[PDB]
Amino acid sequence: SSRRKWNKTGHAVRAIGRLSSLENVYIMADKQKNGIKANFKIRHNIEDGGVQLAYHYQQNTPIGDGPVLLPDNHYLSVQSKLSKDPNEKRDHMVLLEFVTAAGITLVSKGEELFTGVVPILVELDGDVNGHKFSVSGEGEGDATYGKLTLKFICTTGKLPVPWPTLVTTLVQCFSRYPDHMKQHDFFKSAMPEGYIQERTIFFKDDGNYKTRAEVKFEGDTLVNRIELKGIDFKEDGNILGHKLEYNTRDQLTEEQIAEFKEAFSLFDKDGDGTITTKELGTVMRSLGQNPTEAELQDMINEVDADGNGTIDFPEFLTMMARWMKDTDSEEEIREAFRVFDKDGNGYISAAELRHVMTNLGEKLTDEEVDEMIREADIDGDGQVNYEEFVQMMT
């Protein structure tokens, strides 16, 4: 009961945080190169706790001289699932991805090449701090659904970096663009001749990858051919030290989906199954924030898949599934803590939890409030400190 109220509020606070923290794949026109640029952040869960951030900067330019579509600003939203083939002895990764464009509220000739299932081939040669490796992948893409299925093998033996750190490098032409956004699909517009995709990926507190790729049709097959160079890595760090989780935190208990629903109904105050800017603004104010209408619209747009300007119940479930797979940074947890720690002394008092829970539209007996404290209080001091809060929101 008390653990449900912590999880309910924790989810709401984390949700508000993620809506503001730029989690999608942001695409913009690059007129100077007749192509696009993109930026985004990837969260890599560290096996023993914590997150390794990877900040991506990207640019794509057409290989051919034919006309391409230069998009208005929008983003891609990715759902990735990593697994292992039980009958594969080589170092490998199996990948299932669903990628959808959004971010623009309510067709090129190259798009015609993507109406069915298209075979994919991927080849990567890498060198990270002098540790060389090669990867070959094969599978299929079904852009109608934004669906990719690939299997990758390290053809040089043992991969000297974690597989998750190579996912973004290892075919955005398979993204699903909604009907109202077909004019913003640069990737398909450049086909069949293709594009060059370049990135720098900064692993926070560690080294960086530099990648260059040619993506194009070779016959009926969409081929991704990549060179990757990594420098400045720590031999003992999260990447060369292989300290990152592999498997996607995939499975959802019905207790978890139920917690997401309880969180949803904190926002959805009129019980109509969708969250408006008014409702989101109401919750954020009750937590001590003061967003403008433009900010509220922008926050909703980050998860508003259908572009109708509200967060629908399925859109909320989808975002919460995405967010909870990946760990918060310590800066983010400290910020969540400060929603409760209203005076800043490093301790959440009963009066402070009482204030927050009151304002969020809950009538609670002080005994209910005290047993919340009791649940988080690892050292019977009658308060919640940061170390206790960190465990309560993980």
Q: Which residues sit at the interface with Ca ion, rule CB under 5 A? A: 268, 270, 272, 304, 306, 308, 312, 341, 343, 345, 347, 377, 379, 381, 383
Nearer to Ca ion, 366 or 381 (CB): 381
* Cα Rg, the chain, nearest whole Å: 23
Half-sphere exposure of residue 240: CA atoms within 13 angstroms, side-chain side:
19
Q: In the chain, which residues are last before a break of more than 2.5 Å from C to the next N?
A: 106, 170
Is 39 among the annotated ligand-binding positions? no
Residue 40 and residue 54 in contact, taking contact as beta carbons nearer than 8 Å:
no
The set of residues, in sequence order, having a beta carbon less than 8 Å from that of 324 and lying 6+ positions away, is 14, 249, 256
* Smallest separation, CB 347 to Ca ion (Å): 5
Pairing mode, strands 274-275 and 311-312: antiparallel
Written as one string, the DSSP assignment of 205-240 is TS-EEEEEEEEEEETTEEEEEEEEEEES--TTSTTT
Is 48 among the annotated ligand-binding positions? no
Is 345 among the annotated ligand-binding positions? yes
Nearer to Ca ion, 49 or 314 (CB): 314
Is 383 among the annotated ligand-binding positions? yes
* Smallest separation, CB 354 to Ca ion (Å): 12
Pairing mode, strands 195-203 and 208-218: antiparallel
CB atoms within 10 A of CB 345: 11
* Smallest separation, CB 353 to Ca ion (Å): 10
Is 112 among the annotated ligand-binding positions? no
Nearer to Ca ion, 227 or 312 (CB): 312
CB atoms within 10 A of CB 314: 12
Q: Which residue from 229, 238, 99, 77 is spatially nearest to 164, judged by alpha carbons?
A: 238
Nearer to Ca ion, 92 or 354 (CB): 354
Is 326 among the annotated ligand-binding positions? no
* Smallest separation, CB 382 to Ca ion (Å): 7
Is 268 among the annotated ligand-binding positions? yes
Nearer to Ca ion, 114 or 267 (CB): 267
Nearer to Ca ion, 49 or 346 (CB): 346
Residue ranges of the annotated binding site are: 268, 270, 272, 274, 279, 304, 306, 308, 310, 315, 341, 343, 345, 347, 352, 377, 379, 381, 383, 388
Residue ranges of the annotated binding site for Ca(2+) are: 268, 270, 272, 274, 279, 304, 306, 308, 310, 315, 341, 343, 345, 347, 352, 377, 379, 381, 383, 388
